A paper describes a structure:
The [name] channel was found to mediate a major K+ permeability of lysosomes and late endosomes (hence also named KEL), and is not related to canonical K+ channels. The vertebrate [name] proteins are composed of two homologous non-identical repeats, each comprising six transmembrane domains forming dimers; the bacterial homologues consist of only one such repeat and form tetramers. We obtained a crystal structure at a resolution of 2.4 Å of a [name] channel from [name] ([name]) and in combination with functional analysis, propose how selectivity for K+ ions is achieved. Each [name] subunit is composed of six transmembrane helices which assemble to form a tetrameric channel as verified using SEC-MALLS of uncomplexed [name].
Author numbering:
A (entry chain A): 244 to 282, 302 to 483
B (entry chain B), D (entry chain B): 9 to 240
C (entry chain A): 123 to 243
The structure:
C-alpha cells in the first residue's frame, strides 16, 4: 500500500529468484506519480527514493517498457506500473493479475497524470469530412469502441452509454481510483518542453550523472 | 435471496467458518430457551409459558445478527486470519450476552407487563432498583450493542482493504463503503447512551431516562449523523 | 405451389421446415409468406385475385371471412378430429360449420427482467 | 428420495438456512434426552430407562417436523428474508415446546400405563388434576400444533407467491397449492380443539373429552373439511 515497504518486499523476493517491481523508467509518465506524490521539496523527496531503488540494486538502470512487460507476463516480477492497454497481453499469458491503487509515498498518494485519448483531424488533409464520418458514426459508437476495447482496453471510455459496462469491471475501478488521486494534464504548448525536461532529469539521475538537486535546477529553467 | 442485483456473491459455497458460525448461532438461540428447567408439574408448565415473550424478543434479536453474518459471508466469501479473528470476537460477544439478554428480556417484559396491565407480579426478584444498578444496565447492554455493530464495520473495512484481491467492481465497492457507514451509524447510538451514562450529568434517574430514550429515537438520530456528514 | 399466409411475429421458418418435409414426400412446393396487414389484405385479395391457399390468424377474424364466403368448409375425419381438444374446435365454428383447423391458444402475459426486477408488480 | 417425479428440486445444494436449521433440530431432540440427570446409582439407571417411551414419542414427533422442513427446502431452495422470518418462527415454536413436550409425553405415558396395567405409580407428582389445568393442557399443546402447521402453510404460500421467480411448472404449481391446503387442513384440527376449550360449553371435563377426541378423529375430520371445499 506504500512505496517505502517495497525494499523489504524486494529483499524477500530476490531470495526466491524474483523481482518486486519492474516498470518503464525511461518514459517520465511512469515515474511522475512517485515524483509528484508529495508535491520543490516534494520532487526532491520522490526522486531521491527512485534513485535509492536503483542504487540499492532493486531496479535495473535501463528498465524499459518491453523488458518490464515481458518480465511481469513471464512471472519474474511481482508488480508493474501500466495502463488499461497493457491488460490484454497479461490475459494472453497465464498470470493471475490484479490492478490496484498506486503505492503511497510519505503517507500521501502518488499522483499519476491523467490522459484523455483523443482523435484530431490534420489541418493539411483533404479527407476532413470523411474522417468526421468515421470518427462520429463508426468509431465513437457502442459497437465501435467495443471493437477497439476487445483488442487492447481503452480504459474509461468517454461514451455515456458505456457507464454500466465500465462500472462492472474491477480494473476500471482501480484506474478511476488512481485518476482521482492524480490530475488531468494541461493541453498547453509548453507540455513538450516540460516532458523533455523531466525525461532527461529522470534518466540522468537514474544512470548516475547529475545529482537530484541539480536535476530540478536544470528542469525549472 | 440476495440484497443487490449488481453484487456478485463470492460466498455461495459453504465453508468451515460459516459452518462453525451456524453452530454457534443455533446453540445461542437453542440454549437460551433450553437453559430453562424442565417442568415437573402443571404449575411449572404455566410458569414456563410466561417466558415465550422474553424469548421471542431474544430470538428476534439473535437472527437479526445471524442475517447480517449470512449477508457478509455471502458477499465476500472471506476466510483469512483477520476475518477469522473479527468473526470470533463477534461470536464471543454474542455468547457472553446470551444469558444477560434472557435477564433483560424478562425484566423489561415485567415492566411493560405492569404498564399495559396484563400482569401485576413483583420486580423485587430482580434485586434493588437503584441508580447505580440501572446505570450499569445501560452501560452493559449498550457496550454489547456497540461492539456488535463495531465488529460488523471492521469486517466490511477488511473486505474494503481487500477490494482488489476480491475483484470488486464499482457497484460492489460502493456497497461495501455504504455497509461500513451503516454499521458505524448503528454503532453510535449505543456509544452515545454509554458515554452519557458513564459521565452521569444529573446524578440521578434523569441520566437513565435520556440514555434509554436514544434507542426509541434510533431512526431519527441515525438520520442526523448521516445528514451531518453529507452537509459537511 | 402451396402458398401460406402467416404473421411475421410467428414461426414461418419452422412452418417452412414442415413444408420442406411435405415436398420430399409429395413433390409440391411449400412457400411461406408474411405480408403486412394480412388480416385486412386477405379478404380483399382472396375475394378478387388468388391470394393464399391457407390463411393463418387468430380465430376472431374468421367469422367475417365465413360470412363473406371467403373460406371452404373443413371436413376432418373422426380420428383426426379426436387428436385435438374439443374446446379448441368450438372456437373455429361458425353457424354449425368448421371454418378452420385450431393450432394453439394464445394469451398475453407479463414478461419481466428478473435482474432489473426480481419481485415484479 | 423425492416425493414427486415431476418436481425439479431447487434445493439439492445445502445452504446456511438449512445448516442452521439442522443444528436446531439436532439440538432439540438431543437436549430433550440429555437434559435429564446423569445416573449416579443403579436406582437412577432403572428410573432413567422408564423415560424412553416418552422420549420415543417426542423424537418421532420432532423428526416428522424435520422431514417437512427437509422437503420444503428441497423443493424450492428458498433463502429470502420472509422465508428466513417464517423459518425462525417455526424453530422458535419448536424450541419453546421441547420441554413442555417432555412433560406431556411423561404425563400421558403414566395415564396410558395405568390403563393397560403395566405400572401403578402416582400422578400427584404432576400437581392437581383440575378442570382449569386440563383445559390449559389442551389450549397449550393445541396452540403449538396449530402454529407449526400454520407456519408450513405460510411458507408454501410464500413459494406460491414466487412461482414465477422460481420458474414453477404446472405440476409444481399444483403441488405447492396442494401443500398449502394440506397444512391448513392439518392446522384446523388443533384450531378446533383450542376454540372449543376456550369457549368451554359444558363448564366441566366433557369439554376436555371432546377437545381431546378430535385428535383421535384426525383423518376423518380432515376428510370432512376437504370434502366440504370440493362439494361447494
Ligand atoms: C409481557 C407479559 C409477559 C411477562 C413475562 C415475564 C417473565 O418473567 C420470568 O418468568 C420466568 C417464569 O418461568 C421466571 O423463570 C423461572 O422459571 C423458569 C421456568 O422454567 C426457570 O427456568 C427459572 O429458573 C426461573 O427463574 C423468571 O425468573 C421471570 O423473570
Ligand atoms: C407406558 C410405560 C412408561 C411410563 C413412563 C412414565 C415416565 O415418567 C417420568 O419418569 C421419569 C423417571 O426418570 C421422571 O423423571 C425423573 O427422573 C429423571 C431421571 O433422569 C430426572 O431427569 C428428572 O429430574 C425426574 O423428573 C419423570 O418425572 C416422570 O414423569
Ligand atoms: O512519457 C512521457 C509521455 O507521457 C505521456 O504519454 C503516454 C501516453 O499518454 C500513454 O497513452 C502511453 O502510451 O504512454 C505514453 C508514455 O509512454 C504523454 O501523453 C506524452 O506527452 C509524454 O510525452
Ligand atoms: K445443563
Amino acid at each position: 500500500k506504500t512505496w517505502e515497504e517495497i525494499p523489504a518486499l524486494d529483499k524477500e523476493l530476490k531470495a526466491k529468484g524474483k523481482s518486486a517491481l519492474m516498470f518503464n523508467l525511461q518514459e517520465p509518465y511512469f515515474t511522475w506519480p512517485l515524483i509528484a506524490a508529495d508535491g520543490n521539496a516534494g520532487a526532491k523527496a520522490g526522486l531521491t527514493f527512485l534513485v535509492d531503488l536503483i542504487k540499492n540494486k532493486h531496479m535495473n538502470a535501463d528498465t524499459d517498457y518491453s523488458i518490464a512487460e515481458a518480465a511481469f507476463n513471464k512471472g519474474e516480477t511481482a508488480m508493474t506500473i501500466n495502463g488499461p492497454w497493457a491488460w490484454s497481453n497479461i490475459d494472453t499469458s497465464k498470470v493471475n493479475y490484479g490492478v490496484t491503487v498506486l503505492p503511497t509515498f510519505k503517507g500521501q498518494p502518488s499522483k499519476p497524470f491523467v490522459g484523455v485519448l483523443s482523435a484530431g483531424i490534420n489541418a493539411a488533409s483533404p479527407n476532413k469530412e470523411l474522417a468526421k464520418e468515421f470518427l462520429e458514426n463508426y468509431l465513437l459508437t457502442d459497437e465501435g469502441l467495443e471493437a477497439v476495447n476487445k483488442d487492447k482496453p481503452l480504459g474509461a471510455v468517454a461514451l455515456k452509454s458505456y457507464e454500466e459496462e465500465l462500472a462492472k469491471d474491477p480494473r476500471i475501478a482501480a484506474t478511476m481510483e488512481n485518476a482521482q488521486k492524480g490530475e488531468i494534464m494541461p493541453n498547453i504548448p509548453q507540455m513538450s518542453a516540460f516532458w523533455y525536461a523531466v525525461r532527461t532529469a529522470v534518466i540522468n539521475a537514474a544512470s548516475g550523472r547529475q545529482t537530484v538537486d541539480e536535476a530540478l535546477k536544470d528542469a525549472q529553467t | 435471496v440476495g440484497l443487490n442485483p449488481n453484487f456478485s456473491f463470492r460466498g455461495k459455497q459453504q465453508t468451515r467458518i460459516e459452518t462453525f458460525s451456524d453452530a454457534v448461532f443455533a446453540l445461542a438461540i437453542a440454549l437460551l430457551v433450553l437453559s430453562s428447567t424442565i417442568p415437573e408439574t402443571f404449575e411449572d408448565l404455566w410458569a414456563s409459558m410466561r417466558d415465550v415473550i422474553p424469548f421471542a424478543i431474544c430470538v428476534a434479536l439473535i437472527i437479526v445478527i445471524w442475517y447480517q453474518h449470512y449477508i457478509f459471508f455471502l458477499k465476500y466469501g472471506l476466510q483469512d486470519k483477520v476475518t477469522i479473528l473479527l468473526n470470533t470476537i463477534l461470536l464471543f460477544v454474542l455468547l457472553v450476552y446470551v444469558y444477560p439478554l434472557k435477564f433483560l428480556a424478562r425484566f423489561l417484559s415485567e415492566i411493560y407487563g405492569g404498564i399495559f396491565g396484563i400482569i401485576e407480579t413483583d420486580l423485587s426478584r430482580f434485586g434493588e432498583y437503584s441508580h447505580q444498578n440501572l446505570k450499569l444496565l445501560m452501560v452493559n447492554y449498550g457496550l454489547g450493542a456497540f461492539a456488535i455493530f463495531l465488529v460488523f464495520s471492521l469486517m466490511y473495512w477488511r473486505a474494503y482493504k481487500m477490494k482488489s484481491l476480491l475483484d470488486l467492481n464499482s457497484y460492489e465497492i460502493f456497497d461495501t463503503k455504504s455497509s461500513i457507514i451503516a454499521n458505524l451509524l448503528m454503532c453510535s447510538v449505543p456509544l452515545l447512551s454509554l458515554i452519557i451514562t458513564l459521565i452521569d450529568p444529573w446524578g440521578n434517574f434523569r441520566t437513565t431516562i435520556l440514555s434509554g430514550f436514544l434507542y426509541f429515537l434510533y431512526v431519527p438520530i441515525m438520520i442526523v449523523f448521516g445528514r451531518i456528514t453529507s452537509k459537511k | 405451389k402451396l402458398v401460406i399466409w402467416i404473421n411475421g411475429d410467428k414461426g414461418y421458418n419452422g412452418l417452412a421446415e414442415v413444408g420442406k418435409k411435405f415436398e420430399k414426400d409429395t413433390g409440391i412446393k411449400v412457400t411461406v409468406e408474411h405480408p403486412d396487414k394480412l388480416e385486412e389484405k386477405f379478404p380483399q385479395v382472396a375475394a378478387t385475385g388468388d391470394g393464399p391457399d391457407i390463411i393463418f390468424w387468430a380465430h376472431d377474424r374468421f367469422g367475417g371471412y365465413a360470412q363473406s364466403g371467403l373460406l371452404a368448409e373443413i371436413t376432418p375425419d373422426k380420428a383426426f378430429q379426436d387428436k385435438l381438444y374439443p374446446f379448441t374446435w368450438d372456437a373455429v365454428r361458425y353457424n354449425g360449420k368448421l371454418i378452420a383447423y385450431p393450432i394453439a391458444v394464445e394469451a398475453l402475459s407479463l414478461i419481466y427482467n428478473k435482474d432489473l426486477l426480481p419481485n415484479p408488480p
